[PDB]
Amino acid sequence: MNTPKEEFQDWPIVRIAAHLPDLIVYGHFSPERPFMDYFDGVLMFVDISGFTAMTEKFSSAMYMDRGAEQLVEILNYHISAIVEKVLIFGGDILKFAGDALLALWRVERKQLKNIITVVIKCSLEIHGLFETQEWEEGLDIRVKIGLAAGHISMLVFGDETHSHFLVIGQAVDDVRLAQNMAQMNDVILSPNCWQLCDRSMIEIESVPDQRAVKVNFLKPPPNFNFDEFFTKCTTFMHYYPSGEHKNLLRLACTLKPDPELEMSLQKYVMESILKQIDNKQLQGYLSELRPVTIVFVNLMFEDQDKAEEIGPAIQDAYMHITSVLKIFQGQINKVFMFDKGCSFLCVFGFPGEKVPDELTHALECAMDIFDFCSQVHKIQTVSIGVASGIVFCGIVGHTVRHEYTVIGQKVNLAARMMMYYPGIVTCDSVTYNGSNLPAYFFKELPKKVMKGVADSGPLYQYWGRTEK
Ligand SMILES: Cc1n[nH]cc1-c1ccc(F)cc1
Ligand SMILES: [Cl-]
């Protein structure tokens, strides 16, 4: 009797699972919104820092109308190799944001020390991928890595149709601080990561005026064998592909159809992505250089450390944000923590979602979100940056682990505006000029020097309809 091999694994549920971490795929949590959960882990924040001198160059006549296609191809080539490294070393990629990603090794406290060693080896191996690498004949392309460790809270919020999750807490804020101390080729350890790590393994140098450390070397003891040590470490990794599935990058590739699980997983994924997953849209339709308006919403909390307070506040803000965005077919593309503030990357004019007067509407939506969230219990400050122009849209990452993302100078500008101009709604010159709304709706702002942005152009506050 024949025994044909190679099981089917290309189900819709498996395609949806590529867009999600194991944290969600295998999460099995309660129906309530918000849901909060508490654990320990190691975080890795990887930034690709060459990928700016190419995005706006991919929008040039050089690329002959295939700018977005060439951009996503070369980015995915490089990001895919980082993803395979994280997955093989047992990490869970939480989220992609442009040419950057956050990964998690979740583990019980007693295993943090050994898991840190695994995450350090992974990090140096990621740097090794880029040792003699270039984008074009002249531009290097290297990464910066921040590592943090300790207590981590997960927040899941949303409504009956949409879900979003966030990691929160001091380790999360730590990994961002560690990452932006990093220079090209660095691995920076947060102060608590350094306090928790196996110091007999790792040669460090001090970071001036910082308690965070830079890794110089991983110098193993005489009888140390990384492969055997890694094997011992997989004992504590719930979902590490093993045995029969030792050849897979993710246990999620083995997901079987399950209507209840699929209903729950699809809530995290945009409808245009689901349409492609269902073979009802061309697989390449979402890769594009596209004019859009970014509405970047930051919420700062009265107690920035009180996870139990911030959960309901984010839930309340989200409930109103989603209802305002729906009206103009605007989308939440990402949510993440930024200076212990909750940030919503909102996008107007996505594929099949472009509607006229996009600019007037992004501004009125921003103000609507601003007025409501300002009155949300425990929200201390609302800040909104609005910028409009050509941005890259596309699915970024590896075949087994990828997310739809936006990349471009206007994305970074809206993010810098909400941080540098807190407590107000700001917009760039494109939005101001193209709103045609009368000038007295705006206030022209002092020019601030903003990290990463070279000549923002004139910036404005959206003052609104009245003097009050
Ligand atoms: C999210 C995201 N997707 N693409 C770019 C970003 C980003 C995130 C934070 C930030 F400060 C500036 C840009
Ligand atoms: Cl997050």
Side-chain angles (χ1 to χ4, degrees), residues 395-455:
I395 296 166
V396 166
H398 190 290
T399 303
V400 309
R401 193 66 194 93
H402 54 209
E403 279 175 11
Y404 187 75
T405 330
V406 296
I407 303 176
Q409 229 55 264
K410 291 295 185 175
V411 180
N412 313 329
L413 180 60
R416 309 293 172 213
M417 292 159 74
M418 89 200 166
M419 300 314 295
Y420 278 84
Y421 298 89
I424 65 154
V425 180
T426 49
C427 69
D428 68 350
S429 296
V430 174
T431 305
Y432 167 85
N433 291 121
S435 70
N436 252 54
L437 284 173
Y440 65 76
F441 274 51
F442 303 87
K443 179 195 181 172
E444 187 185 11
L445 291 168
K447 321 180 218 69
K448 287 178 180 167
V449 197
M450 298 184 297
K451 291 214 282 288
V453 338
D455 188 29

Short mmCIF file of all heavy atoms in Angstrom, two decimals, residues 395-455:
data_model
loop_
_atom_site.label_atom_id
_atom_site.label_comp_id
_atom_site.label_asym_id
_atom_site.label_seq_id
_atom_site.Cartn_x
_atom_site.Cartn_y
_atom_site.Cartn_z
N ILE A 395 4.56 43.96 2.27
CA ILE A 395 4.78 42.87 3.20
C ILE A 395 6.27 42.66 3.35
O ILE A 395 6.95 42.30 2.39
CB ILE A 395 4.03 41.60 2.77
CG1 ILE A 395 2.51 41.86 2.79
CG2 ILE A 395 4.42 40.45 3.69
CD1 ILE A 395 1.65 40.77 2.03
N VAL A 396 6.77 42.88 4.56
CA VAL A 396 8.18 42.85 4.85
C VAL A 396 8.52 41.68 5.77
O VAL A 396 7.85 41.46 6.75
CB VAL A 396 8.63 44.21 5.47
CG1 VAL A 396 10.03 44.11 6.11
CG2 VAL A 396 8.60 45.32 4.42
N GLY A 397 9.59 40.96 5.45
CA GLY A 397 10.05 39.91 6.33
C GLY A 397 10.36 38.64 5.58
O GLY A 397 10.73 38.68 4.41
N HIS A 398 10.20 37.52 6.26
CA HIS A 398 10.46 36.20 5.69
C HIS A 398 9.11 35.54 5.25
O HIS A 398 8.06 35.86 5.81
CB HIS A 398 11.10 35.37 6.82
CG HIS A 398 11.65 34.06 6.39
ND1 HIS A 398 10.82 33.02 6.00
CD2 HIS A 398 12.94 33.66 6.31
CE1 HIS A 398 11.63 32.03 5.66
NE2 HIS A 398 12.91 32.37 5.84
N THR A 399 9.15 34.60 4.30
CA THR A 399 7.96 33.79 3.97
C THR A 399 7.22 33.28 5.24
O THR A 399 6.02 33.39 5.29
CB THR A 399 8.40 32.55 3.13
OG1 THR A 399 9.07 33.06 2.00
CG2 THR A 399 7.22 31.62 2.71
N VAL A 400 7.92 32.73 6.24
CA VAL A 400 7.25 32.14 7.43
C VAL A 400 6.82 33.22 8.49
O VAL A 400 6.08 32.91 9.43
CB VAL A 400 8.08 30.98 8.07
CG1 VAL A 400 8.49 29.94 7.01
CG2 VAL A 400 9.30 31.51 8.83
N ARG A 401 7.30 34.47 8.32
CA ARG A 401 7.19 35.52 9.36
C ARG A 401 7.41 36.92 8.76
O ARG A 401 8.54 37.33 8.50
CB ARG A 401 8.11 35.25 10.59
CG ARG A 401 7.82 36.14 11.83
CD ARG A 401 6.46 35.91 12.51
NE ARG A 401 6.17 37.00 13.44
CZ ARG A 401 5.47 38.09 13.14
NH1 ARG A 401 4.94 38.23 11.92
NH2 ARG A 401 5.29 39.04 14.04
N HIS A 402 6.30 37.64 8.53
CA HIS A 402 6.29 38.89 7.78
C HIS A 402 5.07 39.68 8.11
O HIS A 402 4.09 39.14 8.58
CB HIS A 402 6.37 38.63 6.23
CG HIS A 402 5.33 37.69 5.68
ND1 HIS A 402 5.59 36.92 4.57
CD2 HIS A 402 4.06 37.44 6.07
CE1 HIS A 402 4.49 36.23 4.34
NE2 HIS A 402 3.56 36.51 5.22
N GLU A 403 5.11 40.98 7.83
CA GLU A 403 4.03 41.90 8.18
C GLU A 403 3.98 42.98 7.14
O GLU A 403 5.00 43.42 6.61
CB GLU A 403 4.33 42.56 9.55
CG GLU A 403 3.97 41.68 10.73
CD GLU A 403 4.34 42.22 12.09
OE1 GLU A 403 4.74 43.40 12.22
OE2 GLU A 403 4.25 41.41 13.04
N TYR A 404 2.79 43.42 6.85
CA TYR A 404 2.59 44.63 6.03
C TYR A 404 3.11 45.86 6.81
O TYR A 404 2.79 46.05 7.99
CB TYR A 404 1.11 44.80 5.74
CG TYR A 404 0.81 45.90 4.76
CD1 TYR A 404 1.06 45.73 3.40
CD2 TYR A 404 0.28 47.11 5.18
CE1 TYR A 404 0.76 46.75 2.48
CE2 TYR A 404 -0.02 48.12 4.28
CZ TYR A 404 0.22 47.93 2.93
OH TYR A 404 -0.09 48.94 2.06
N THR A 405 3.91 46.68 6.14
CA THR A 405 4.56 47.80 6.79
C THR A 405 4.59 49.00 5.83
O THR A 405 4.45 48.86 4.60
CB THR A 405 6.03 47.45 7.21
OG1 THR A 405 6.20 46.06 7.51
CG2 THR A 405 6.48 48.23 8.40
N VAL A 406 4.79 50.17 6.41
CA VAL A 406 5.06 51.42 5.69
C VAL A 406 6.47 51.90 5.97
O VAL A 406 6.96 51.77 7.09
CB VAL A 406 3.99 52.48 5.99
CG1 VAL A 406 2.65 52.00 5.47
CG2 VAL A 406 3.93 52.81 7.50
N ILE A 407 7.16 52.41 4.95
CA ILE A 407 8.52 52.94 5.09
C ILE A 407 8.59 54.25 4.31
O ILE A 407 8.11 54.35 3.18
CB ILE A 407 9.63 51.96 4.58
CG1 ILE A 407 9.58 50.60 5.29
CG2 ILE A 407 11.09 52.61 4.67
CD1 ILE A 407 10.60 49.54 4.76
N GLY A 408 9.19 55.26 4.92
CA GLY A 408 9.47 56.48 4.17
C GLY A 408 9.73 57.63 5.10
O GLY A 408 9.36 57.57 6.27
N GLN A 409 10.37 58.67 4.56
CA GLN A 409 10.66 59.91 5.28
C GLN A 409 9.43 60.51 5.93
O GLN A 409 9.56 61.02 7.01
CB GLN A 409 11.36 60.91 4.37
CG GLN A 409 12.63 61.54 4.97
CD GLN A 409 13.69 60.56 5.43
OE1 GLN A 409 13.77 60.19 6.62
NE2 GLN A 409 14.57 60.15 4.52
N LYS A 410 8.24 60.43 5.29
CA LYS A 410 7.01 61.03 5.87
C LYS A 410 6.51 60.27 7.08
O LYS A 410 5.87 60.86 7.95
CB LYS A 410 5.90 61.16 4.82
CG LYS A 410 6.19 62.20 3.74
CD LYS A 410 6.28 63.61 4.28
CE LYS A 410 6.44 64.59 3.15
NZ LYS A 410 6.40 65.95 3.66
N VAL A 411 6.80 58.95 7.13
CA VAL A 411 6.50 58.12 8.29
C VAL A 411 7.38 58.59 9.45
O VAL A 411 6.86 58.81 10.55
CB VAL A 411 6.62 56.57 8.01
CG1 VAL A 411 6.30 55.76 9.27
CG2 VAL A 411 5.72 56.15 6.85
N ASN A 412 8.70 58.74 9.22
CA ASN A 412 9.64 59.17 10.29
C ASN A 412 9.31 60.59 10.76
O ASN A 412 9.38 60.87 11.95
CB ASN A 412 11.15 59.10 9.84
CG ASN A 412 11.55 57.81 9.15
OD1 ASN A 412 11.02 56.73 9.43
ND2 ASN A 412 12.47 57.89 8.21
N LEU A 413 8.97 61.49 9.81
CA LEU A 413 8.59 62.86 10.12
C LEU A 413 7.37 62.92 11.07
O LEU A 413 7.46 63.58 12.09
CB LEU A 413 8.36 63.71 8.84
CG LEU A 413 7.94 65.18 9.07
CD1 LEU A 413 8.99 65.94 9.86
CD2 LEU A 413 7.57 65.89 7.80
N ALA A 414 6.24 62.26 10.73
CA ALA A 414 5.06 62.23 11.63
C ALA A 414 5.40 61.74 13.05
O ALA A 414 4.91 62.32 14.03
CB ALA A 414 3.95 61.38 11.03
N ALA A 415 6.24 60.66 13.16
CA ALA A 415 6.78 60.13 14.42
C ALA A 415 7.61 61.18 15.16
O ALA A 415 7.42 61.35 16.36
CB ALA A 415 7.60 58.86 14.16
N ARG A 416 8.52 61.88 14.47
CA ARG A 416 9.31 62.92 15.15
C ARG A 416 8.44 64.08 15.58
O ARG A 416 8.65 64.58 16.67
CB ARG A 416 10.53 63.42 14.35
CG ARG A 416 11.46 62.32 13.79
CD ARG A 416 12.21 61.53 14.85
NE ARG A 416 12.93 60.40 14.27
CZ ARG A 416 13.13 59.23 14.88
NH1 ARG A 416 12.66 59.02 16.11
NH2 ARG A 416 13.80 58.26 14.27
N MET A 417 7.47 64.51 14.74
CA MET A 417 6.51 65.58 15.11
C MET A 417 5.74 65.31 16.42
O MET A 417 5.71 66.19 17.26
CB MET A 417 5.53 65.89 13.99
CG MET A 417 6.17 66.53 12.81
SD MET A 417 5.20 66.33 11.32
CE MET A 417 4.02 67.40 11.64
N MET A 418 5.11 64.13 16.57
CA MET A 418 4.37 63.83 17.80
C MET A 418 5.29 63.79 19.04
O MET A 418 4.80 64.07 20.13
CB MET A 418 3.51 62.55 17.67
CG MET A 418 4.26 61.27 18.06
SD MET A 418 3.55 59.72 17.45
CE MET A 418 4.95 58.72 17.78
N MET A 419 6.60 63.49 18.89
CA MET A 419 7.50 63.46 20.04
C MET A 419 8.08 64.82 20.38
O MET A 419 8.25 65.12 21.56
CB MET A 419 8.61 62.39 19.88
CG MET A 419 8.07 60.94 19.72
SD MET A 419 6.74 60.45 20.89
CE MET A 419 7.67 60.51 22.48
N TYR A 420 8.39 65.64 19.37
CA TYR A 420 9.05 66.92 19.54
C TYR A 420 8.05 68.04 19.75
O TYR A 420 8.41 69.11 20.23
CB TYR A 420 9.91 67.23 18.30
CG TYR A 420 11.27 66.56 18.29
CD1 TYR A 420 11.42 65.25 17.83
CD2 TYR A 420 12.40 67.23 18.74
CE1 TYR A 420 12.68 64.63 17.80
CE2 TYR A 420 13.66 66.62 18.72
CZ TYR A 420 13.79 65.32 18.25
OH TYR A 420 15.04 64.73 18.23
N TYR A 421 6.77 67.82 19.36
CA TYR A 421 5.74 68.82 19.58
C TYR A 421 4.62 68.13 20.40
O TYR A 421 3.55 67.87 19.86
CB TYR A 421 5.23 69.39 18.25
CG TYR A 421 6.25 70.12 17.40
CD1 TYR A 421 7.02 69.44 16.46
CD2 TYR A 421 6.41 71.50 17.51
CE1 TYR A 421 7.93 70.11 15.65
CE2 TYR A 421 7.32 72.18 16.71
CZ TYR A 421 8.08 71.48 15.78
OH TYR A 421 8.98 72.18 15.01
N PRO A 422 4.86 67.83 21.71
CA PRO A 422 3.85 67.08 22.49
C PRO A 422 2.59 67.90 22.79
O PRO A 422 2.68 69.12 22.85
CB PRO A 422 4.58 66.74 23.79
CG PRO A 422 5.60 67.84 23.96
CD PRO A 422 6.04 68.18 22.55
N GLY A 423 1.44 67.25 22.97
CA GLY A 423 0.24 67.91 23.48
C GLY A 423 -0.58 68.66 22.46
O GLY A 423 -1.60 69.26 22.81
N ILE A 424 -0.14 68.62 21.18
CA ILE A 424 -0.82 69.36 20.10
C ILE A 424 -0.94 68.46 18.84
O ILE A 424 -0.32 67.40 18.79
CB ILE A 424 -0.14 70.75 19.80
CG1 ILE A 424 1.30 70.58 19.25
CG2 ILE A 424 -0.19 71.72 21.02
CD1 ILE A 424 1.75 71.70 18.39
N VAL A 425 -1.75 68.89 17.86
CA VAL A 425 -1.81 68.26 16.54
C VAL A 425 -0.90 69.08 15.64
O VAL A 425 -1.07 70.30 15.56
CB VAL A 425 -3.27 68.15 16.01
CG1 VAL A 425 -3.31 67.47 14.62
CG2 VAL A 425 -4.18 67.42 17.01
N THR A 426 0.07 68.42 14.97
CA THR A 426 0.94 69.13 14.03
C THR A 426 0.78 68.52 12.63
O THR A 426 0.41 67.35 12.47
CB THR A 426 2.41 69.03 14.44
OG1 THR A 426 2.69 67.68 14.71
CG2 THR A 426 2.74 69.85 15.67
N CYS A 427 1.08 69.32 11.61
CA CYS A 427 1.12 68.78 10.27
C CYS A 427 2.29 69.37 9.48
O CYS A 427 2.83 70.40 9.87
CB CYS A 427 -0.21 68.95 9.54
SG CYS A 427 -0.61 70.66 9.13
N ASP A 428 2.68 68.69 8.39
CA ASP A 428 3.76 69.14 7.53
C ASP A 428 3.19 70.16 6.51
O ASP A 428 2.00 70.46 6.54
CB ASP A 428 4.41 67.89 6.85
CG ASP A 428 3.54 67.16 5.83
OD1 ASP A 428 2.33 67.47 5.74
OD2 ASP A 428 4.05 66.27 5.16
N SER A 429 4.04 70.67 5.62
CA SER A 429 3.63 71.60 4.54
C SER A 429 2.72 70.99 3.47
O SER A 429 1.84 71.69 2.99
CB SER A 429 4.85 72.22 3.85
OG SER A 429 5.54 73.00 4.80
N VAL A 430 2.94 69.73 3.09
CA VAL A 430 2.07 69.07 2.09
C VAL A 430 0.61 69.10 2.59
O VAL A 430 -0.29 69.54 1.87
CB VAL A 430 2.53 67.63 1.72
CG1 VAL A 430 1.51 66.95 0.80
CG2 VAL A 430 3.91 67.62 1.07
N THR A 431 0.39 68.65 3.84
CA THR A 431 -0.95 68.59 4.43
C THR A 431 -1.50 70.01 4.57
O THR A 431 -2.63 70.26 4.19
CB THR A 431 -0.85 67.87 5.78
OG1 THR A 431 -0.25 66.59 5.61
CG2 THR A 431 -2.18 67.74 6.47
N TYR A 432 -0.71 70.94 5.10
CA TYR A 432 -1.20 72.30 5.29
C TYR A 432 -1.65 72.93 3.94
O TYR A 432 -2.82 73.35 3.80
CB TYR A 432 -0.13 73.15 5.99
CG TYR A 432 -0.39 74.65 5.96
CD1 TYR A 432 -1.20 75.26 6.92
CD2 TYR A 432 0.20 75.47 5.00
CE1 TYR A 432 -1.42 76.63 6.92
CE2 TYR A 432 -0.03 76.85 4.98
CZ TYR A 432 -0.84 77.43 5.95
OH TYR A 432 -1.08 78.78 5.97
N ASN A 433 -0.72 72.97 2.96
CA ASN A 433 -0.98 73.56 1.64
C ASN A 433 -2.11 72.87 0.89
O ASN A 433 -2.93 73.54 0.28
CB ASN A 433 0.30 73.61 0.80
CG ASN A 433 1.29 74.59 1.35
OD1 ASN A 433 2.42 74.25 1.70
ND2 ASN A 433 0.90 75.84 1.46
N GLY A 434 -2.16 71.56 0.95
CA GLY A 434 -3.16 70.82 0.19
C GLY A 434 -4.48 70.63 0.90
O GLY A 434 -5.39 70.08 0.29
N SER A 435 -4.61 71.06 2.17
CA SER A 435 -5.92 71.04 2.85
C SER A 435 -6.84 72.11 2.22
O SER A 435 -8.06 71.95 2.19
CB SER A 435 -5.76 71.28 4.36
OG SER A 435 -5.37 72.62 4.66
N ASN A 436 -6.25 73.20 1.73
CA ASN A 436 -6.89 74.46 1.31
C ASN A 436 -7.75 75.13 2.41
O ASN A 436 -8.14 76.28 2.21
CB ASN A 436 -7.68 74.34 0.00
CG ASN A 436 -6.99 75.04 -1.13
OD1 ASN A 436 -5.81 74.78 -1.43
ND2 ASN A 436 -7.70 75.96 -1.76
N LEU A 437 -8.03 74.39 3.56
CA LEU A 437 -8.63 74.92 4.80
C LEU A 437 -8.02 76.29 5.08
O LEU A 437 -6.83 76.46 4.77
CB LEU A 437 -8.33 74.00 6.02
CG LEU A 437 -9.12 72.72 6.17
CD1 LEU A 437 -8.57 71.87 7.33
CD2 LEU A 437 -10.60 72.99 6.40
N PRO A 438 -8.76 77.28 5.64
CA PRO A 438 -8.17 78.62 5.77
C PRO A 438 -6.98 78.66 6.74
O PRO A 438 -6.91 77.84 7.66
CB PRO A 438 -9.34 79.49 6.25
CG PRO A 438 -10.30 78.55 6.85
CD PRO A 438 -10.13 77.22 6.20
N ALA A 439 -6.06 79.61 6.52
CA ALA A 439 -4.79 79.69 7.26
C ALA A 439 -4.96 79.78 8.78
O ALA A 439 -4.12 79.26 9.51
CB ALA A 439 -3.97 80.87 6.76
N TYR A 440 -6.03 80.43 9.26
CA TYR A 440 -6.29 80.67 10.68
C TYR A 440 -6.73 79.39 11.43
O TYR A 440 -6.95 79.45 12.64
CB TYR A 440 -7.29 81.83 10.87
CG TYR A 440 -8.68 81.55 10.33
CD1 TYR A 440 -9.56 80.71 11.02
CD2 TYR A 440 -9.13 82.13 9.15
CE1 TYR A 440 -10.84 80.46 10.53
CE2 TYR A 440 -10.41 81.88 8.66
CZ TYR A 440 -11.26 81.04 9.35
OH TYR A 440 -12.52 80.78 8.88
N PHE A 441 -6.87 78.27 10.72
CA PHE A 441 -7.04 76.93 11.33
C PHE A 441 -5.68 76.41 11.80
O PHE A 441 -5.60 75.41 12.50
CB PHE A 441 -7.64 75.94 10.31
CG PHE A 441 -9.15 75.92 10.21
CD1 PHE A 441 -9.87 77.10 10.04
CD2 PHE A 441 -9.85 74.72 10.27
CE1 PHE A 441 -11.27 77.07 9.94
CE2 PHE A 441 -11.25 74.70 10.16
CZ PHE A 441 -11.94 75.88 10.00
N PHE A 442 -4.61 77.09 11.42
CA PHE A 442 -3.26 76.58 11.68
C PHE A 442 -2.44 77.60 12.42
O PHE A 442 -2.76 78.78 12.41
CB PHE A 442 -2.55 76.19 10.37
CG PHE A 442 -3.29 75.17 9.56
CD1 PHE A 442 -4.26 75.57 8.63
CD2 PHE A 442 -3.03 73.81 9.71
CE1 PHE A 442 -4.97 74.62 7.89
CE2 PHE A 442 -3.74 72.86 8.97
CZ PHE A 442 -4.70 73.27 8.07
N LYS A 443 -1.39 77.16 13.08
CA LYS A 443 -0.36 78.01 13.61
C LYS A 443 0.97 77.55 13.05
O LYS A 443 1.32 76.40 13.21
CB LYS A 443 -0.32 77.96 15.13
CG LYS A 443 0.81 78.88 15.58
CD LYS A 443 1.23 78.73 16.98
CE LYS A 443 2.33 79.75 17.14
NZ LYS A 443 2.72 79.84 18.55
N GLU A 444 1.72 78.45 12.41
CA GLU A 444 3.05 78.11 11.92
C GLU A 444 4.00 77.97 13.13
O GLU A 444 4.01 78.84 14.00
CB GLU A 444 3.53 79.18 10.94
CG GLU A 444 4.84 78.83 10.26
CD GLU A 444 5.36 79.94 9.37
OE1 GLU A 444 4.82 81.07 9.46
OE2 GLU A 444 6.31 79.68 8.60
N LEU A 445 4.76 76.88 13.18
CA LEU A 445 5.56 76.52 14.35
C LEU A 445 7.06 76.92 14.26
O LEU A 445 7.63 77.02 13.16
CB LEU A 445 5.41 75.04 14.69
CG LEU A 445 4.03 74.63 15.22
CD1 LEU A 445 3.91 73.16 15.26
CD2 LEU A 445 3.75 75.18 16.59
N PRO A 446 7.70 77.15 15.43
CA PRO A 446 9.18 77.22 15.44
C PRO A 446 9.76 75.93 14.86
O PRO A 446 9.22 74.85 15.11
CB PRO A 446 9.51 77.36 16.92
CG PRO A 446 8.27 77.83 17.57
CD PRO A 446 7.13 77.34 16.77
N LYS A 447 10.85 76.05 14.07
CA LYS A 447 11.59 74.91 13.47
C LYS A 447 12.45 74.23 14.55
O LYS A 447 13.37 74.84 15.09
CB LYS A 447 12.50 75.37 12.31
CG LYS A 447 11.93 76.45 11.38
CD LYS A 447 12.93 76.80 10.28
CE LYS A 447 12.96 78.27 9.92
NZ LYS A 447 13.53 79.11 11.02
N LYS A 448 12.16 73.00 14.87
CA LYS A 448 12.95 72.19 15.81
C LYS A 448 13.88 71.27 15.03
O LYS A 448 13.51 70.77 13.97
CB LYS A 448 12.03 71.37 16.75
CG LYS A 448 11.35 72.24 17.81
CD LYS A 448 10.40 71.50 18.72
CE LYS A 448 9.78 72.48 19.71
NZ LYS A 448 8.61 71.90 20.44
N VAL A 449 15.10 71.07 15.55
CA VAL A 449 16.02 70.10 14.95
C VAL A 449 15.57 68.69 15.40
O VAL A 449 15.49 68.42 16.60
CB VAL A 449 17.52 70.37 15.24
CG1 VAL A 449 18.40 69.60 14.25
CG2 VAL A 449 17.84 71.86 15.17
N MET A 450 15.26 67.82 14.42
CA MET A 450 14.71 66.50 14.72
C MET A 450 15.60 65.38 14.22
O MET A 450 15.89 65.31 13.02
CB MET A 450 13.26 66.37 14.23
CG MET A 450 12.32 67.35 14.90
SD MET A 450 10.57 67.21 14.47
CE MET A 450 10.66 67.58 12.71
N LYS A 451 16.04 64.49 15.16
CA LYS A 451 16.90 63.31 14.93
C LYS A 451 16.37 62.46 13.78
O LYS A 451 15.27 61.91 13.89
CB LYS A 451 17.06 62.45 16.20
CG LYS A 451 17.88 63.11 17.32
CD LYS A 451 18.71 62.11 18.13
CE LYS A 451 17.93 61.32 19.17
NZ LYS A 451 17.54 62.16 20.33
N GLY A 452 17.14 62.38 12.70
CA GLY A 452 16.78 61.61 11.51
C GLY A 452 16.16 62.42 10.39
O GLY A 452 16.20 61.98 9.23
N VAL A 453 15.57 63.59 10.68
CA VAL A 453 14.94 64.39 9.62
C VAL A 453 15.87 65.56 9.26
O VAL A 453 16.26 66.36 10.13
CB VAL A 453 13.42 64.78 9.82
CG1 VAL A 453 12.71 63.86 10.80
CG2 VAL A 453 13.21 66.25 10.20
N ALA A 454 16.23 65.63 7.97
CA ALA A 454 16.96 66.76 7.37
C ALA A 454 15.95 67.55 6.56
O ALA A 454 15.35 67.02 5.61
CB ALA A 454 18.09 66.25 6.48
N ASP A 455 15.76 68.83 6.94
CA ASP A 455 14.76 69.79 6.45
C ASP A 455 13.37 69.19 6.33
O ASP A 455 13.01 68.64 5.29
CB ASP A 455 15.18 70.49 5.15
CG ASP A 455 14.23 71.62 4.75
OD1 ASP A 455 13.61 72.23 5.66
OD2 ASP A 455 14.11 71.88 3.53
#
